[PDB]
């Protein structure tokens, strides 16, 4: 039978205590929702693939055998026995002997890793769906098979495989939840975000590659064996003065027969390994032969000094080849060699002469050197490897004359001249190739690759996901192809709405109606057609007062990192080694200190724009305007406004130091209180010098007059305006008391600085190539000279992490400074005055603005005027009264059909056309659209 | 095709053009009103008189020089076409942005052709010529330097993106102040 | 080379993060510049300006 | 190096040491007497004039 | 005039530092290139350089 493993078989991977952390670990785990084999006993000879999960629900426990292989483990319900020998009521297990000490859902996990037999278990009372971690048990020392014996109920058997998991430890340090990473795309998203909750959006989780199907080894049709007998078995070797250079080219060389031969004393290969020599193709081979003394055999090597190296045979530093030496004490004053030369020999240069004797250390040694040339010129000599038949239009692992690579081979229209063997591109990568066997040209294209992204709504809403394979044509993977790639798991909809999740190329995705993920082309907005005519105007008759919040970052957390601590934790040796790198870490400290100072300057520039600390009067008679929600209240300990508190609740030891800001939050709040009091009681006057008091309903009339609305409008709609403003201020509280997404611009600033720091600290856990990431471990395991190398390796990389961090912080601080300068400009122009700049101090005609402190930022409540109820009218640029044209002094002419009036342009207030609201210039024969109407004379 | 991927912009060119068409239609048919809320229609010759009144010229000037003003504007618009149909040097600020991103990428790809002290710049060549322990050293040598090329590229891109963001913020401000309204700021 | 690259830690999760931030910021820039209009206005067929 | 203090952390009786977000040894178990000791790095900080 | 003076100073300190980085070994036997080239052979001097 069969059943499902509902997130079972999860165990503590190690003996480390972790609390309140989501830790990602990858090892042998039981996959989530895998098919686990049920059994009912009556033997079943199961395998041991990599590890066995084992659940059980019985008292009987006739599962009394654990055979491997010989390893034979027995767990007899009272005593554990382990017998490792060549084995072949009753003991019929078979035809070192360790012994350990003498209604329920018993869970067990067995694995054999690195000679360790690990048992994990959880005996819990009563597959049941749920979650339960498995604590360890006895770990034994010491095999690919399994058995259960039935010595004459329900048990389930899984099979662990290598999987990555994201375990969630609670405050008590026990695992409460886990995520199988490679189960579904949503779990991959959870892994990438290191979180159990995912917000709505698009997340790059992984990358997608088309794997090669088969390998194509393609070598030329040559079979003549290379002449290696005639340079190794030659009767007479030339003397080391004139070493005999014999060229080998255009043949098949078998280097294995030379290597496996035991006649050779030393076989030292530089730049290649002797075992791999048969897999390679060389453009040219040079075999230089000679004879020397036994003690000079070490001098035949790159970068060696001695008489032989400098005067007789000089190998270059970048010598790719092999050196073969055998003691030939069988075949003497016939070995001339130079002893005195006026300089050192050039590499591979042949030219006072001495001739040491030989009487059968001082023994003769016959040596040859095989200089290879691994250029990209045409390969001539190759190994004995066979040439497979080629395939095309398929991602394969090709090998043309040692030119390895991966890609699809296609027929090419490229015309190769008949001496050209391969082609290149701008990138200097092998764009084409010529097949050695048949002289044809094949284009190389790397087979498809690209990132894969997961379209998801918030996990609160659903667990549905779509998957975007970016920039692939998924004939190579319902299913819908787009210009941004292709999307699976989401259906195409011909409608068009506002973008919810951006895919790209005009495509967005959203979770909508059963509910599913739909993909569509974004709609840029509601279609509107303006009823434009050359004599019709639209005048507003009413208006609204709108309060909109603009959030601006101002500063970020001041930080300072001592290099000597971060790189060299209280270590003298590492400090002395760090001094060799000069003054990197005086200047890193200087940079971070500059950033920190700049943060205080940013806050000073934004908030300290007021000379004095103004205070609002105890009596609050502002013409009906209610500022209780933004003015400070003395009842609270921190003298913060209601909205300020709502904002301050919506934002959340390795040489690191976080310096406190110079201005505490209470004092930022005091600055903002002063600005509010000045704006309310004095208007824009307090920014231009001394605060000149004025009733609020009057500076409001001034501010209306400044947007083109005459001041009688305010005094005639005082109560309506006050009620509108109060309602808007109330709506701000509702927008901020429920939704935390409005503060994101600040939250990111808090998050970016955190992620940057955590990363930095985590870079202390990396080896960077060294034996260990812990400095004291290296210093306690190694001597001084050898530890110096590893410590230098660590410094080079911890210093690089610091440089990366500081560069990121400098760039981010530049961004924050730009935002703070903008915020200072808004405070100067939107708060200390009213701005005629459009869409600067909010949308609409700006009336005023209110600052509110926010964590590492500021919030401007922009109070704006928005005309509301338009009405059509017929209009005319001018009026002909008595042969003379009258133009509106301030406003525009309108008509309700019968009479003609002149009205201001932002509020329908019609008036009788007289000689004081109009001015006369010219005659009515040049103006286009002028109409006939009487102009009253007072 | 070396791990590089160029993602498409979210807004296609047709749709940028649709946005600009909408802005032009609003400016022509409604003036600055469509930026402050609902688009209130007004004859073009009138919002033009408003705009003259906003620079200190009374509005009879426009109505008495309507045809002259229209002809002057039409001639200027015609001259723009001649300036752009023959000379490509006016667009340089954009062209550099296209070039800088190209040169940065090509350089990056070309850094894959460098040894960085190793025996070869091709990873498979090292893996096929050397054993595991000796190839480890050379591969580490290559990583240290390919990673450095990436860090250099990303730092350059971050700085350049900061510059582009500054320019885009300026362009947004101009659209808000120059298009959605008329600006008293001098030489802005 | 991947196993060897793991010894350098998380340089290349953060490099990807940086480039992704740049790419997102580009779309934000275009949105900020051009999407300043609530509706898609259309000019009338008659052009009498 | 650090100060050893008594810990309220509850170690399960197979756990020999503890860690934090930084993957640094936040706690330890004494081999001789089976008790838990919190590790805190002793005080450090810049000095300014 | 400090805003200008700092600009003059920052460019100076950056340059001096750069020049002073020529006096550092960076792990080599010496910071002077000609000294290495005059003390060591080609193959061994290659490593230090
Ligand atoms: C065979 C070797 C064997 C193993 C591996 C084993 C594991 C094991 N069983 C336990 C509980 C227990 N184990 C059993 C009995 C069994 N549990 C089994 O896996 C089997 C096969 C039996 C015998 C039929 C019982 C009855 C308890 C106590 C549960 C209770 O409170 O009633 C415990 C917890 C002990 C403690 O700290 O209190 C362990 C570690 N017990 C064994 O005897
Ligand atoms: C302008 O709009 C306001 C509302 O925005 C109107 O005031 C409303 O009037 C109705 C009665 O006509 C009341 O029921 C509402 O309670 C009022 N709202 C507020 C906020 O006071 C006002 O009447 C409109 N003016 C004109 C001339 O139409
Ligand atoms: C300004 O608005 C606040 C609420 O935002 C008013 O405070 C309320 O006052 C009423 C009495 O009129 C109480 O019943 C409420 O409990 C109060 N609410 C809060 C949150 O304090 C305040 O009265 C208004 N100011 C004026 C002058 O009317
Ligand atoms: C057992 O698991 C396999 C693999 O998931 C699945 O195809 C099969 O349907 C499962 N069997 C049952 C009875 O669920
Ligand atoms: C687990 O954590 C809770 C947190 O509320 C705590 O009360 C409890 O004492 C801890 N220990 C156990 C065994 O529950
Ligand atoms: C032998 O070499 C020739 C030379 O091009 C080639 O045409 C032929 O296919 C080769 N034979 C085989 C069996 O590969
Ligand atoms: C040299 O000759 C011996 C015996 O004649 C033989 O065993 C050996 O393989 C030969 N070596 C070469 C390289 O030909
Ligand atoms: C994708 O593949 C199809 C079928 O091979 C082809 O017609 C199309 O041109 C390819 N490219 C696309 C859709 O961009
Ligand atoms: C959407 O429009 C395309 C246009 O070719 C059409 O083929 C398709 O049937 C339409 N789908 C629906 C659901 O209307
Ligand atoms: C003005 O007239 C046009 C067309 O006659 C109409 O579409 C529009 O709704 C009218 N405006 C109002 C406010 O009714
Ligand atoms: C226009 O307004 C005048 C004065 O208010 C009024 O007498 C007349 O009836 C109105 N006509 C229309 C069509 O509204
Ligand atoms: C433009 O206005 C003139 C006079 O003001 C009028 O004759 C003409 O009909 C108007 N245009 C249209 C399309 O009606
Ligand atoms: C306006 O009045 C003048 C003179 O009284 C006359 O010539 C002209 O035709 C009139 N136009 C209209 C549209 O009434
Ligand atoms: C010997 O080991 C036991 C085991 O915990 C320990 O309790 C005891 O203190 C040790 N004795 C000494 C002298 O340390």
């Amino acid at each position: 039978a069969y059943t499902n493993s509902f997130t079972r078989g999860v165990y503590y991977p190690d003996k480390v205590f972790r609390s309140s952390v989501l830790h990602s670990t990858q090892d042998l785990f039981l996959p989530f929702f895998s098919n686990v084999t049920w059994f009912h006993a009556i033997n079943p000879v199961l395998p041991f693939n990599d590890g066995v999960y084992f659940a059980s629900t019985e008292k009987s426990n006739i599962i009394r055998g654990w055979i491997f292989g010989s390893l034979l483990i027995v767990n007899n319900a009272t005593n554990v026995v382990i017998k490792v020998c060549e084995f072949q009521s009753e003991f019929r297990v078979y035809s070192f002997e360790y012994v350990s000490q003498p209604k329920n859902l018993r869970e067990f996990v067995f694995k054999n890793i690195d000679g360790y037999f690990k048992i994990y278990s959880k005996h819990t009372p009563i597959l049941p769906q749920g979650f339960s971690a498995l604590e360890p048990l006895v770990d034994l020392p010491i095999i690919t098979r399994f058995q259960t014996l039935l010595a004459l109920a329900a048990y389930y058997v899984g099979y662990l495989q290598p999987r990555t998991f994201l375990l969630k430890y609670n405050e008590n340090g026990t695992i409460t939840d886990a995520v199988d990473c490679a189960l579904d795309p949503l779990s991959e998203t959870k892994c990438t975000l290191k979180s159990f909750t995912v917000e709505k959006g698009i997340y790059q989780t992984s990358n997608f590659r088309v794997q090669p199907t088969e390998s194509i080894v393609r070598f030329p049709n040559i079979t003549n064996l290379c002449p290696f007998g005639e340079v190794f078995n030659a009767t007479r070797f030339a003397s080391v003065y004139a070493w005999n250079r014999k060229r080998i080219s255009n043949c098949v060389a078998d280097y294995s027969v030379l290597y496996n031969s035991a006649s050779f004393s030393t076989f030292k290969c530089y730049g290649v390994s002797p075992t791999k020599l048969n897999d390679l193709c060389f453009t040219n081979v040079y075999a230089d032969s000679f004879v020397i003394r036994g003690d000079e055999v070490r001098q035949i090597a790159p970068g060696q000094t001695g008489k032989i190296a400098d005067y007789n045979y000089k190998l270059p530093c970048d010598f790719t080849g092999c050196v073969i030496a055998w003691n030939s004490n069988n075949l003497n004053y016939n070995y001339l060699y130079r002893l005195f030369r006026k300089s050192n020999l050039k590499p591979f240069e042949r030219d006072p002469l001495q001739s040491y004797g030989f009487q059968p250390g001082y023994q003769p040694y016959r040596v040859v050197v095989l200089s290879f040339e691994l250029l990209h010129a045409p390969a001539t000599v190759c190994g004995p490897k066979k040439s497979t038949n080629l395939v095309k239009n398929k991602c394969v692992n090709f090998n043309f004359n040692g030119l390895t690579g991966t890609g699809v081979l296609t027929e090419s229209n490229k015309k190769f001249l008949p001496f050209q063997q391969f082609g290149r591109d701008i990138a200097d990568t092998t764009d084409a190739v010529r097949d050695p066997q048949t002289l044809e040209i094949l284009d190389i294209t790397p087979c498809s690759f690209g990132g894969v992204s997961v379209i998801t709504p918030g996990t609160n809403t659903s667990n549905q996901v779509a998957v975007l394979y970016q920039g692939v044509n998924c004939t190579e993977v319902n299913v819908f192809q787009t210009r941004a790639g292709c999307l699976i798991g989401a259906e195409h909809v011909n409608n068009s709405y506002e973008c919810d999740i951006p895919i790209g190329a005009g495509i967005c995705a959203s979770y909508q109606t059963s509910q599913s993920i739909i993909a569509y082309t974004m709609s840029l907005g509601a279609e509107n057609s303006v009823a434009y005519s050359n004599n019709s105007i639209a005048i507003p008759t009413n208006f609204t007062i709108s309060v909109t919040t603009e959030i601006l970052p101002v500063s970020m957390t001041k930080t300072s990192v001592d290099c000597t601590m971060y790189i060299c934790g209280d270590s003298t040796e590492c400090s002395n080694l760090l001094l060799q790198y000069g003054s990197f870490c005086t200047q890193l400290n200087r940079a971070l200190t500059g950033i920190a100072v700049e943060q205080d300057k940013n806050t000073q520039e934004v908030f300290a724009q007021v000379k004095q600390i103004y205070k609002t009067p105890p009596i609050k008679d502002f013409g009906g305007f209610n500022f209780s929600q933004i003015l400070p209240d003395p009842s609270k300990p921190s003298k913060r406004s209601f909205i300020e508190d709502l904002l301050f609740n919506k934002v959340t030891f390795n040489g690191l130091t976080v310096l406190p800001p110079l201005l505490t939050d209470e004092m930022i709040a005091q600055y903002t209180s002063a600005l509010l009091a000045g704006t309310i009681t004095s208007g824009w006057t307090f920014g231009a010098g001394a605060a000149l008091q004025i009733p609020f309903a009057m500076q409001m009339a001034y501010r209306f007059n400044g947007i083109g609305v005459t001041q009688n409008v305010l005094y005639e709609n005082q109560k309506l305006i006050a009620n509108q403003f109060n309602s808007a201020i109330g709506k701000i509280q509702d927008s901020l008391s429920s939704t935390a997404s409005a503060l994101g611009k600040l939250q990111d600033v808090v998050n970016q600085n955190a992620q940057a720091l955590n990363t930095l600290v985590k870079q202390l856990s990396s080896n960077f190539g060294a034996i260990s990431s812990v400095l004291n471990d290296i210093l306690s395991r190694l001597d001084k000279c050898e530890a110096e190398v590893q410590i230098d390796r660590l410094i080079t990389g911890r210093l690089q992490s610091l440089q990366t961090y500081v560069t990121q912080q400098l760039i981010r601080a530049a961004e924050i400074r730009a935002s703070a300068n903008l915020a200072a400009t808004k405070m100067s122009e939107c708060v200390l005055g009213q701005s005629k700049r459009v869409d600067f101090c909010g949308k609409g005609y700006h009336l005023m603005s209110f600052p509110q402190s926010a964590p590492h930022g500021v919030v401007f409540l922009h109070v704006t005027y928005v005309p509301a109820q338009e009405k059509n009218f017929t209009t005319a640029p001018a009026i002909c009264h008595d042969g003379k044209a009258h133009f509106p002094r301030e406003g525009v002419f309108v008509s309700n059909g019968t009479h003609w009036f002149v009205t201001q342009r932002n509020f329908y207030e019609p008036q009788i056309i007289t000689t004081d609201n109009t001015f006369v210039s010219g005659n009515c024969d040049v103006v286009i659209g002028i109409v006939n109407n009487t102009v009253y004379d007072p």
Side-chain angles (χ1 to χ4, degrees), chain A residues 416-436:
Chain A
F416 271 38
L417 309 180
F419 71 93
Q420 273 159 342
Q421 304 290 346
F422 58 104
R424 292 270 195 70
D425 52 353
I426 301 299
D428 291 331
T429 55
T430 45
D431 203 356
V433 70
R434 175 181 281 281
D435 168 273

Side-chain angles (χ1 to χ4, degrees), chain A residues 294-365:
Chain A
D295 55 354
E296 297 161 338
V297 76
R298 63 180 179 81
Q299 288 197 20
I300 307 301
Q304 282 296 322
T305 317
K307 303 302 182 56
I308 313 300
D310 63 359
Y311 296 140
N312 303 113
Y313 196 51
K314 187 69 183 172
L315 291 184
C317 298
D318 56 320
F319 168 71
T320 297
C322 294
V323 182
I324 315 170
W326 68 95
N327 188 1
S328 88
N329 209 352
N330 313 121
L331 281 75
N332 198 358
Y333 296 13
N334 310 140
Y335 300 139
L336 73 165
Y337 82 103
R338 184 147 303 182
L339 190 42
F340 299 111
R341 201 175 180 278
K342 302 207 176 313
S343 70
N344 273 32
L345 277 185
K346 303 296 297 311
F348 292 139
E349 187 191 16
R350 190 194 291 171
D351 53 351
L353 318 168
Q354 209 266 324
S355 305
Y356 49 85
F358 274 107
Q359 302 176 85
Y362 77 105
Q363 284 170 112
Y365 267 59

Side-chain angles (χ1 to χ4, degrees), chain A residues 567-701:
Chain A
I567 307 183
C568 305
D570 64 274
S571 177
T572 306
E573 302 89 1
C574 180
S575 311
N576 297 351
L577 275 182
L578 191 52
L579 288 190
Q580 303 199 285
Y581 287 77
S583 77
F584 275 121
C585 279
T586 65
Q587 66 169 315
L588 284 185
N589 287 12
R590 266 205 316 261
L592 281 178
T593 304
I595 293 168
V597 166
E598 183 210 284
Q599 299 315 289
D600 295 344
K601 187 186 69 199
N602 292 347
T603 312
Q604 189 73 26
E605 194 197 12
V606 174
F607 292 102
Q609 293 209 8
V610 68
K611 313 140 182 58
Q612 314 181 274
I613 300 302
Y614 302 108
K615 278 188 64 51
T616 184
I619 55 169
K620 311 294 192 298
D621 49 348
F622 304 125
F625 293 80
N626 190 5
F627 295 117
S628 74
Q629 318 309 131
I630 54 177
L631 281 178
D633 44 353
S635 76
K636 302 176 164 199
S638 45
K639 301 300 160 295
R640 299 210 283 245
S641 81
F642 190 81
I643 299 191
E644 281 187 22
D645 282 330
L646 290 183
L647 301 161
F648 272 87
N649 304 343
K650 279 297 156 68
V651 179
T652 66
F653 297 95
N654 300 291
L656 274 297
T657 312
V658 174
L659 317 174
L662 166 62
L663 289 177
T664 59
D665 297 346
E666 176 55 40
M667 291 185 347
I668 306 300
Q670 204 165 5
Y671 281 159
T672 60
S673 161
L675 291 153
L676 288 172
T679 315
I680 289 157
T681 52
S682 55
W684 53 60
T685 64
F686 84 113
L692 308 165
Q693 74 253 23
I694 184 172
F696 188 79
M698 285 199 187
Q699 84 189 15
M700 201 52 38

Side-chain angles (χ1 to χ4, degrees), chain A residues 386-421:
Chain A
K386 277 72 66 177
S387 162
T388 71
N389 174 237
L390 81 166
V391 290
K392 297 186 299 187
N393 313 299
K394 168 156 58 184
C395 184
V396 295
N397 203 357
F398 60 87
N399 183 12
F400 288 90
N401 313 319
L403 194 150
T404 52
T406 292
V408 301
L409 325 176
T410 51
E411 299 295 272
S412 45
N413 53 354
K414 287 177 179 181
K415 55 182 77 68
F416 271 38
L417 309 180
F419 71 93
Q420 273 159 342
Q421 304 290 346

Side-chain angles (χ1 to χ4, degrees), chain A residues 545-550 625-627 629-631 643-644 647 672 675-681 696 699-700 703 725 729 732 826-827 830-833 841 846-853 858-864:
Chain A
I545 302 290
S546 67
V547 177
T548 61
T549 79
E550 181 167 15
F625 293 80
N626 190 5
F627 295 117
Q629 318 309 131
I630 54 177
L631 281 178
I643 299 191
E644 281 187 22
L647 301 161
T672 60
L675 291 153
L676 288 172
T679 315
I680 289 157
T681 52
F696 188 79
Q699 84 189 15
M700 201 52 38
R703 291 162 177 283
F725 172 75
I729 287 291
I732 298 305
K826 297 223 181 217
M827 188 88 63
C830 307
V831 185
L832 267 63
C841 308
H846 177 245
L847 295 177
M848 47 191 293
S849 303
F850 299 119
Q852 297 293 277
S853 68
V858 69
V859 169
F860 295 100
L861 314 186
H862 299 302
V863 187
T864 59

